Structure 1
Amino acid sequence: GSHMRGPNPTAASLEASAGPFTVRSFTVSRPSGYGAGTVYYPTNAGGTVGAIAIVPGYTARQSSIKWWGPRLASHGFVVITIDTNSTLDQPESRSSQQMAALRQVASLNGTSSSPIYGKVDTARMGVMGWSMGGGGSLISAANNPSLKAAVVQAPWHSSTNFSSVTVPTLIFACENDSIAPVNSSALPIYDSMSRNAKQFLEICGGSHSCANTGNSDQALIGKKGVAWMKRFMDNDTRYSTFACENPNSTRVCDFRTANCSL
């Protein structure tokens, strides 16, 4: 049940600005159930790839999370970054819109006129987001346990109880976050989940935008997000060490993981 694409990974290949595949993109002409979207895709991955939908936080737009689009697609994923219907949408709405974005990618995979026709294995999907978009991602995972992975950054929701989530979930937290503090948001969310592979990585000195486009720890954060998606989306056990390991970085001020098998 594995779906191995690309050269055997190395830390350097995961830390680079791109993986092995060329990336192209298009703007969704008629977004279905969300505000706007950009689809990033590998031109020649060598097989079908999973799809990932990424949602920003409150007041934010695609730019805040856009770096993940080419970063992940270049390793073998179709990635849709969205703007929400309103910048002021809350986590439940963000979840619905994230799942609408996945749905539309899945549909376009079956549409002959799309550049991503036949590129996607629609049985392998994942969710990502920042802050309220991260809370949205975890609501998506709670509601749709067939999702293969979640990677969220500085997550926030009005409740921290994600005890029903069984999807492999990586949380990036930001040490000095004053919007969604680690001790009242990211860490309670992490600690609520007992039935899944999970991981928590706290960036030293980070503000609430520490994982966003323009961040200075992208080599490490990108490596970890790509590795997590490769391991769990693709069931690619070549990525087990990279997905499960403590980074051993002066950039990281706390690291926790559970149920990630080597």
Structure 2
Amino acid sequence: SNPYARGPNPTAASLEASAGPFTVRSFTVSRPSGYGAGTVYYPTNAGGTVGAIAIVPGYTARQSSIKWWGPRLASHGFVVITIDTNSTLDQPSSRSSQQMAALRQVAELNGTSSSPIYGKVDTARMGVMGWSMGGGGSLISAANNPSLKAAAPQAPWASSTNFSSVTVPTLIFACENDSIAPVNSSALPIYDSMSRNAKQFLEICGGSHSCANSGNSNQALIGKKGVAWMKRFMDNDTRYSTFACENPNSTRVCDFRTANCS
């Protein structure tokens, strides 16, 4: 049996809901280690240790832009840290450095008896997410740390689109009408460069650059896919294989591609 499986058997309805099965609490990191600020979201009743995910905003952006992922993922059985960068104008490499520093601090807090997440984290199972340059930073983190279990960047931007070294299962959320990091010059070339991993490309119909941010009109689909990807690859949970690998057959998806998934 799978020692990392948490929660009940998933359904489309349970994955599309605003909240998963677990109760969520949060705290602000009092002394951020290698990044600007952080909020940690965690389940109080997951029934076992869970993996950790670090999420980074875009250029000029703060935690508010990606906050919705905190409760959404944590409620399904993950410890999630959303960060502010040292500067809102940090570039993708620095964002990657800060994302990994946030993962390191979540691991440190797992061994700190005063922390609300004491003993709640499996520090060997980690994932990376982020918006725009923070999405580029997530891909850099995956390329440099192949022990990461999953990556799910959104509307990514990066100096180069060559991520051919990435072996980490990667889901790329793209926004059809992105005018900041256009799909044909950023997200899709990034996707096409990856030849050694489980990968997926999910483009949201009519979406602006912020199409997967807090307040988006597609939280049912985007949240379902993000949670399913993290569940399948961070937890090795084959109960999520279809949700993770399937073409959603959704009227909200204008482009779908997947490879080496199922």
TM-score (norm 2): 0.99
Secondary structure of 1:128's partner?
strand
1:249 is displaced (CA, Å) by 0.9
What is the alpha-carbon distance in structure 1 between the residues aligned to residue 177 and residue 71 of structure 2? Answer: 28
What is the alpha-carbon distance in structure 1 between the residues aligned to residue 63 and residue 12 of structure 2? Answer: 27
- Tell me which residue corresponds to 2:49: 48
Q: Can you list the C-alpha shifts for 1:123-169, whole angstroms capped at 9, x where unaligned?
A: 00000000000000000000000000000100000100000000000
What is the alpha-carbon distance in structure 2 between the residues aligned to residue 182 and residue 115 of structure 1? Answer: 40
1:67 is displaced (CA, Å) by 0.1
Q: Can you list the C-alpha shifts for 1:160-211, whole angstroms capped at 9, x where unaligned?
A: 0000000000000000000000000000000000000000000000000000
Q: Does 1:12 align with 2:29?
A: no
What is the alpha-carbon distance in structure 1 between the residues aligned to residue 47 and residue 126 of structure 2? Answer: 18
What is the alpha-carbon distance in structure 1 between the residues aligned to residue 87 and residue 217 of structure 2? Answer: 29
Secondary structure of 1:232's partner?
helix
* 1:1-262 equivalent positions in 2, closer than 5 A: 3-261=4-262
What is the alpha-carbon distance in structure 1 between the residues aligned to residue 250 and residue 127 of structure 2? Answer: 27
What is the alpha-carbon distance in structure 1 between the residues aligned to residue 118 and residue 172 of structure 2? Answer: 31
What residue ranges of structure 2 are gaps of 5+ in the alignment?
A: none
1:21 is displaced (CA, Å) by 0.2
What is the alpha-carbon distance in structure 1 between the residues aligned to residue 217 and residue 256 of structure 2? Answer: 19
Corresponding pairs, count: 259
1:96 is displaced (CA, Å) by 0.1
1:250 is displaced (CA, Å) by 1.0
What is the alpha-carbon distance in structure 1 between the residues aligned to residue 97 and residue 159 of structure 2? Answer: 16
What is the alpha-carbon distance in structure 2 between the residues aligned to residue 241 and residue 50 of structure 1? Answer: 21
Secondary structure of 2:95's partner?
helix
What is the alpha-carbon distance in structure 1 between the residues aligned to residue 8 and residue 52 of structure 2? Answer: 20
Extract structure 1 runs of 4+ deviating beyond 6 A: none
What is the alpha-carbon distance in structure 2 between the residues aligned to residue 214 and residue 4 of structure 1? Answer: 30
CA RMSD in angstroms, aligned pairs only: 0.3
1:51 is displaced (CA, Å) by 0.2
Secondary structure of 2:258's partner?
strand
1:224 is displaced (CA, Å) by 0.1
Q: Can you list the C-alpha shifts for 1:211-253, whole angstroms capped at 9, x where unaligned?
A: 0000001100000000000000000000000000001111100
What is the alpha-carbon distance in structure 1 between the residues aligned to residue 221 and residue 120 of structure 2? Answer: 28
1:109 is displaced (CA, Å) by 0.2
What is the alpha-carbon distance in structure 1 between the residues aligned to residue 121 and residue 15 of structure 2? Answer: 22
What residue ranges of structure 1 are gaps of 5+ in the alignment?
A: none
What is the alpha-carbon distance in structure 1 between the residues aligned to residue 113 and residue 147 of structure 2? Answer: 26
Q: Can you list the C-alpha shifts for 1:51-106, whole angstroms capped at 9, x where unaligned?
A: 00000000000000000000000000000000000000000000000000000000
TM-score (norm 1): 0.99
What is the alpha-carbon distance in structure 2 between the residues aligned to residue 26 and residue 189 of structure 1? Answer: 34
